[PDB]
Amino acid sequence: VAAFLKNVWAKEPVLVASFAIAGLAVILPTLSPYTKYSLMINRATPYNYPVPLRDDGNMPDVPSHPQDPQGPSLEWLKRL
Amino acid sequence: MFMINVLTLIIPILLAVAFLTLVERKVLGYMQFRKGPNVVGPYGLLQPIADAIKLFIKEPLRPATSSISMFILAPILALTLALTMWIPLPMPYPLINMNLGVLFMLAMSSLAVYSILWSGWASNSKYALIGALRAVAQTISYEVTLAIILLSVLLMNGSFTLSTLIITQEQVWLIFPAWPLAMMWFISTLAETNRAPFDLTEGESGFNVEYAAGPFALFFMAEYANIIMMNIFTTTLFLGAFHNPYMPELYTINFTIKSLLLSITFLWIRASYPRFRYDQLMHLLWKNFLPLTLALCMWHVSLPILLSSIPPQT
Amino acid sequence: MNLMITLLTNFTLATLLVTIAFWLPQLNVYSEKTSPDPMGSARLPFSMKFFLVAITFLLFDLEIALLLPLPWASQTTNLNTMLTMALLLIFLLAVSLAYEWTQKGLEWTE
Amino acid sequence: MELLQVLKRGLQQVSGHGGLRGYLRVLFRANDVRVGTLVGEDKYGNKYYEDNKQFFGRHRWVIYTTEMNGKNTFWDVDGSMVPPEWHRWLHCMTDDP
Amino acid sequence: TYKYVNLREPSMDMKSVTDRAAQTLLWTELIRGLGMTLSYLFREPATINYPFEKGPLSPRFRGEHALRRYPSGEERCIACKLCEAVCPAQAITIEAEPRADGSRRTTRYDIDMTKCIYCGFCQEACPVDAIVEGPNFEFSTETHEELLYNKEKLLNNGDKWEAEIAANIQADYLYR
Amino acid sequence: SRGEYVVAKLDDLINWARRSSLWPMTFGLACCAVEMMHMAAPRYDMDRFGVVFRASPRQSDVMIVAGTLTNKMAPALRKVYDQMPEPRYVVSMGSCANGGGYYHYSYSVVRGCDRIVPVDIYVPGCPPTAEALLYGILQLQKKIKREKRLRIWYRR
Amino acid sequence: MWFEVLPGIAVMGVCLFIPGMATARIHRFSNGGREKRVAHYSYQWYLMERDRRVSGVNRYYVSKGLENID
Amino acid sequence: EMVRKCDPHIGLLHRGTEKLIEYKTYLQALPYFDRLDYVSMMCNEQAYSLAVEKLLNIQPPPRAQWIRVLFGEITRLLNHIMAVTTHALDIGAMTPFFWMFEEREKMFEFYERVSGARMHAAYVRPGGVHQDLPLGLMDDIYEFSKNFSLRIDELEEMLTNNRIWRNRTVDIGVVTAEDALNYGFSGVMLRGSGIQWDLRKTQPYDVYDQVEFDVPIGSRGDCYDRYLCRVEEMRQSIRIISQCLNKMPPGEIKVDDAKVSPPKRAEMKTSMESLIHHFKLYTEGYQVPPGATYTAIEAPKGEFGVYLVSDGSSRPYRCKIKAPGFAHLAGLDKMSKGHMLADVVAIIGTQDIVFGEVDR
């Protein structure tokens, strides 16, 4: 399998570079520790208005003010 | 006041296309161990003026055209599309600040092959028509790698906005993460403009040999407007300059120097290489640039995701 | 509106220069010319290969048209599906190129 | 810095033609501004110049007269305006003016 | 006593194969050619400033024809028709007679400059150095018959160019 | 008058532009082609006069006939001259284009290109040197400089 | 020598410098000494039309600050 | 795209040269050979001179032979510069054309200093050369030769390793050795196919048995190996020029038979026999003994030969001119089968074709 690689790298190095770049593009997002952060950043981006909830009386994880401690925080994005 | 801005765009385009001819003749002179024009003006500065006045009073060839209307519309379309490719160019501010300036430029350069096609069919020579069809097939071939290289780059931009492409390159030139895209882009812009080593309209009779000298000068100046424009677009795209919003002329001087050096690089490439045979540049597109361009298109799709560097939409 | 003004100015400058280039040497009264091509009078021979490269352009350009919303598509929250379908469209353009290759479709204009 | 010596040589080429007027005179007639040692002047007003630092072909030249045999040769310089005694020297048939 | 151009079998180890692949993908020889063209960009060109600067010549140069005279005013040509006998293009037409003092002199000495091949066989056939092919090359005309020289035109060319022709012959007659 | 002054200045303008941008179509027939190529070579360099190197025949200003015109190529010369747009000029370079030359008495040679086309400059030599050909091109430029097209038009 | 080509490059470079300098100065002249408002999206156009209405003089670039409230 | 048939119609420069030779004397018919292969002037002069001298049973003096070989190799440089640079100019490499025509211009100055004409010298004559070298010429030929290798180096830097130039020449115009012998090819057209044949080695003339040089042999028969053979023949021509400059002997330059070569003008104007011989050589010409020779040299285009027939008079009965371009352009149709329209211009380039020697 090693003689085939040197043979095609001597004859057709454009296609070797092509299949190498394509194979890296296929396998490498499933191996990266940062692929989680792409999804986390895309769901942290507020295109819409954050429509508030009617306070029934029992929602301890929903804040009453933006500067309240509870709620989703973005210190992971400020730090990274 | 806006019409003043339109004229201060389009009249210096015509002047820079006029003097690009002089710069080409001089630089190709000194690279060929000779001088260029230095008799007509001081340092040849009146050579484009003399040559334009010569061409505009040269006799018409007065040919038999199949269509009079397409024989009129091919220079009109060539000049109009050569002038409309400049209006979204951010330098540092575009004339028309449109949200899809990249896609607009890609579309209006895709429309430029009708000048070649209509001018080839308007000539009654079958050989001129065959050469026109070869030029059209060459140009629409290299449009593919234009579109895909441009898409792969703008996956780092986030939008088709040309003005955002300055914001993208504030920390680094975009030729650093995309130099294989940049070099295939540069050769594809070299093959879009029928520019050497891809000038098979001068290899052994092109599409526009049947026009008069006036309309041939109009095709020629549309082609050089396309050359200067694609160099400016390449400079905006990969070699993006520093911009102070309180001092815009710094960006204007910086991109102007880079675009001049890139146009002189076109001049210096035509003074260095033999032509391709036609199947050899088809081989260069379909069998060399397009597999690499698809591989790097997969790479620039998947790379902002694996590095968490997806650019903003706005 | 500014775009329509600019397009009209570009078209008007182009039509003006074309009219000047077609009618400034017509003022000269040079002479009437009689003047009684590599092919002599033969009909234009069709080549299948130019038509094949034009259709191959059209098909890959439709695949490009599918590929064009990718910089906006990367902003989604379904990134695994977006990445799979993006790599799948570029792979199908590659498979179309490979089938055009290996069945001698890219030959004598390679 | 040696760019400064280049620009000083340009300024003394302006000085060497007797200022900006004679400088522009030789610039628009000769398309060339470099100064040489005046080898001589014939009976017509043609002036003959050496510069042995120039390469072989540039090292001898003529600035043609502005009037010869009644003709206004200010812009209409002519290669056959050179008399035969200077035609050996200018065409390098001899070293001797 | 011979050599083989292009008979090098290239090395197939990973070093040389990677060198050739880097040349293919990174375009090294194309940058080499661009560098050589850039190196000529900064050389001084070889262009002389014609008409003010002239191309170098030699006293052997074969230009415009001339009939010469002695240092007494008497013309050298004694009508022997050797120049028109040796003339490879038959450009010279000569008719002669004895003139009023009985000298052997021509009455017709035509040179068609549009038949002439400018090879100077006439000036080396000439036993008295009468015909020469002088140093003038800048004698283009606007009309064809202005290049059909008669004896008057050739004698006027000799009177015009003798100060240069005699010095060129003085430079070159020891090689003849 | 005033119109005489205007047509004088306009003739000077159009003659400046035509002589300062001459484009040659060179017939590389015979040995004179090599010396035309030396007139284009970097020592003499026609392009510094605005005289470009190898314009196409449908856009050229002067036809430089450089070499022997044989009888088998006389209609090809005439056809190229008929396809040239006006003002077209013809420079006859060297003795075979001028009067047949060394092949004047041949069965197969047109005795001078002036039998086929009208000729403006006759450049003599076998071959004429590249400096002599450049002299002939500058004499052609002086011939264009003294043209009186609009002045004769104003007097007709 | 090679600096003979620099006058043509200077003329062409000034001609390339002119359009960007012109559009920068025309944008600052037509928009109150500032950049032209970039409205690629309908929220930016909404705020711009709000500025044109709150300025009172039918010009979005006439800015109104704390002095326009009590 | 493919070329099925290539039919070259020629005769557009047929000027009836060798019928015009039949009415002119041997000295008078010498300058027709300047104009056949009109980039290889003194080589054709040498071929005609060797033909006439072979029929005359005389030989040139040694200094004449060394001058003829010196200017034959200067001429070989001229022709290979023309060949390589116009073969690249037609393909599209326009720049080494201009780079090499200044060295070409300096060699035309060498011709003009030795004869008076820049191209058609009429300098190599039957009997020797017409005139001796002027003083200071060999020093300037040395100053040229000292620098010309770098000019070949930068030409070869532009074209040889360039991938575009290799794609225009590597599988183009491939000629087998047996077809090249059968089609009558000569010179590089043989040696590109591997045929070890050069007439300056095998059938040597004037002093080529005394100069030492190598012969570039191709291996594939294509346009590219013929290109490399012409570049290496420029190299080896510089080698021969150095050996000619160092080994130039003293002595006369015409044969000292005043019934063949004309006497000096100092003794023509003094001696009776010399004036009679000057008269008869410039009016009648010398008589050549009756016979037919075929004398061929290795011109820079290939075997350039003269089949020269004398009947006893001072004018040739017949002068057939064998030129390499005739057979090479007859082989053009075979060499272009299975190739493309932009390959035919490379094949007409690699066959160094000048139509003065093709059509006569």
Ligand SMILES: CCCCCCCCCCCCCCCCCC(=O)OC[C@H](COP(=O)([O-])OCC[N+](C)(C)C)OC(=O)CCCCCCCCCCCCCCCCC
């Ligand atoms: C925008 C600013 C300027 C940009 C740069 C451009 C400036 C310089 C321009 C020079 C003049 C060029 C004139 C035209 C030349 C045209 C000919 C030519 O070059 O053809 C292209 C040639 C064509 O190949 P070819 O024709 O030479 O080779 C023969 C081809 N076969 C075998 C098919 C017959 O090469 C390419 O197509 C390469 C394009 C760029 C490739 C970039 C690869 C990047 C690295 C990938 C990874 C490699 C490592 C291995 C994997 C590692 C993984 C971690």
Ligand SMILES: CCCCCCCCCCCCCCCCCC(=O)OC[C@H](COP(=O)(O)OCCN)OC(=O)CCCCCCCCCCCCCCCCC
């Ligand atoms: C899995 C990731 C995604 C993969 C798909 C997307 C890839 C992106 C690039 C698309 C390219 C499309 C066209 C490819 C066609 C391949 C087949 C081919 O060309 O075969 C013919 C060729 C011989 O060439 P010839 O027929 O003469 O053609 C004229 C040129 N000489 O034969 C050859 O040249 C032989 C070439 C085949 C071997 C290449 C090996 C490369 C190895 C790289 C490292 C490992 C990569 C692993 C990925 C999977 C590999 C199978």
Ligand SMILES: CCCCCCCCCCCCCCCCCC(=O)OC[C@H](COP(=O)(O)OCCN)OC(=O)CCCCCCCCCCCCCCCCC
């Ligand atoms: C963004 C900037 C872009 C700039 C682009 C242009 C750059 C180069 C500009 C030109 C530079 C200077 C050129 C001078 C040329 C020579 C003019 C001249 O002197 O002509 C002399 C001629 C005959 O004069 P005469 O009196 O006969 O002479 C005998 C004297 N004893 O007399 C005549 O010919 C008559 C007079 C003609 C004068 C013409 C001068 C040049 C015209 C240039 C027009 C365009 C200039 C730029 C426009 C925009 C900026 C203002």
Ligand SMILES: CCCCCCCCCCCCCCCCCC(=O)OC[C@H](COP(=O)(O)OCCN)OC(=O)CCCCCCCCCCCCCCCCC
């Ligand atoms: C033979 C005939 C003659 C041939 C020569 C002349 C024609 C060819 C050359 C001219 C081509 C005309 C192109 C017209 C449309 C161009 C596309 C376009 O409008 O893109 C710009 C922009 C899109 O970007 P975006 O920023 O999203 O929009 C603004 C929102 N803030 O969108 C905008 O800014 C929208 C602006 C308003 C809409 C403009 C519509 C223009 C008029 C309709 C087309 C007229 C031309 C018809 C013929 C075309 C060619 C066949």
Ligand SMILES: CCCCCCCCCCCCCCCCCC(=O)OC[C@H](COP(=O)(O)OCCN)OC(=O)CCCCCCCCCCCCCCCCC
């Ligand atoms: C009421 C009065 C006015 C009537 C209408 C006139 C309109 C303006 C026309 C321009 C002025 C008229 C004179 C035109 C030139 C005539 C004089 C001339 O040619 O002088 C010769 C001189 C150079 O001498 P020469 O012999 O050519 O050089 C040999 C080399 N040493 O040549 C020179 O020095 C250079 C001459 C340059 C010519 C003028 C500059 C170019 C044209 C500018 C106007 C047109 C521009 C149009 C747009 C072009 C494209 C951008």
Ligand SMILES: CCCCCCCCCCC1=C(C)C(=O)C(OC)=C(OC)C1=O
């Ligand atoms: C509105 C008109 C502006 C001036 C016309 C365009 C600028 C002048 C270019 C002249 C020119 C040059 C120098 C030139 O070299 C050339 O040949 C390749 C041309 O094509 C025919 C040209 O048109």
Ligand code: SF4
């Ligand atoms: S130079 Fe030659 S062709 Fe001319 S006249 Fe003299 S002998 Fe005849």
Ligand code: SF4
């Ligand atoms: S020019 Fe000389 S050779 Fe000719 S006829 Fe006169 S004297 Fe004799």
Ligand code: SF4
């Ligand atoms: S005039 Fe003479 S040198 Fe010139 S091309 Fe003709 S034969 Fe050759």
